[PDB]
Write a protein that binds this ligand. Sequence first.
Ligand SMILES: NC(=O)[C@H]1CCCC[C@H]1NC(=O)C1(NC(=O)[C@H](Cc2ccc(OP(=O)(O)O)cc2)NC(=O)OCc2cccc(N)c2)CCCCC1
Ligand SMILES: NC(=O)[C@H]1CCCC[C@H]1NC(=O)C1(NC(=O)[C@H](Cc2ccc(OP(=O)(O)O)cc2)NC(=O)OCc2cccc(N)c2)CCCCC1
Lengths: 96, 96
Amino acid sequence: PHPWFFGKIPRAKAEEMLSKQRHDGAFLIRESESAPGDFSLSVKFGNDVQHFKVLRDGAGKYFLWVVKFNSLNELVDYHRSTSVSRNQQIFLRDIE
Amino acid sequence: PHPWFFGKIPRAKAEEMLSKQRHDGAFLIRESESAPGDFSLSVKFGNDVQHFKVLRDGAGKYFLWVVKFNSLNELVDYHRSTSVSRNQQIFLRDIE
Ligand SMILES: NC(=O)[C@H]1CCCC[C@H]1NC(=O)C1(NC(=O)[C@H](Cc2ccc(OP(=O)(O)O)cc2)NC(=O)OCc2cccc(N)c2)CCCCC1
Ligand SMILES: NC(=O)[C@H]1CCCC[C@H]1NC(=O)C1(NC(=O)[C@H](Cc2ccc(OP(=O)(O)O)cc2)NC(=O)OCc2cccc(N)c2)CCCCC1
């Protein structure tokens, strides 16, 4: 059962928790509060926590920037090895 | 972190696992293999395991039959107390 799926929690709690984490890339997927039906990827990086809105196309694939995936699961794993950001190199790693 | 979110697993493994469970209502949400981008709710009931396709409307709310929710989280909790089925009375309960 995935350890990164936190269901519907408030952005700030995600921040509060993640800020407590030790490694850059620790993340969780949460269900959006501001954007009902949208997922939000939260990841730790340095002093801050960043959030990426998970997009979904007309065919329903999800993606962050351009490469499409047919599941949060896939998208998550994929970025475990391909930066989630384009400025910095941030790789997802399971929270502790 | 929710114990019912299994990410993307094959329907049959869900069946295999759930069949092993002890109580009617033990369930998990899995990402659909046949319907990419769609979630599937699997629940145990008697000898069988049932699957409900999780619908999503144009506003993006999710639902199973008619009452809409803005998150799998909510939808899941709600049915912990309101049968997921209309013939039988099946309530979600966390897997073991
Ligand atoms: N997929 C992406 O997020 C890419 C591609 C599309 C747009 C933007 C890209 N993302 C980004 O540039 C970055 N993120 C963003 O632009 C994020 C994307 C996002 C938008 C809404 C969200 O709603 P929620 O918080 O209730 O769940 C969550 C995430 N935007 C963002 O944080 O805006 C500020 C913010 C502050 C307070 C409330 C909200 N909703 C949003 C990358 C990380 C640093 C900040 C910029
Ligand atoms: N939300 C629902 O599922 C309600 C409302 C809309 C349609 C049907 C309703 N569901 C149902 O009647 C019941 N379920 C159904 O009709 C389910 C709904 C569903 C459809 C596709 C799915 O794809 P996946 O397996 O790869 O994830 C998963 C679930 N249908 C179903 O099991 O069809 C048989 C089946 C067999 C083999 C492969 C597939 N995909 C489907 C309730 C439980 C007993 C069976 C009937």
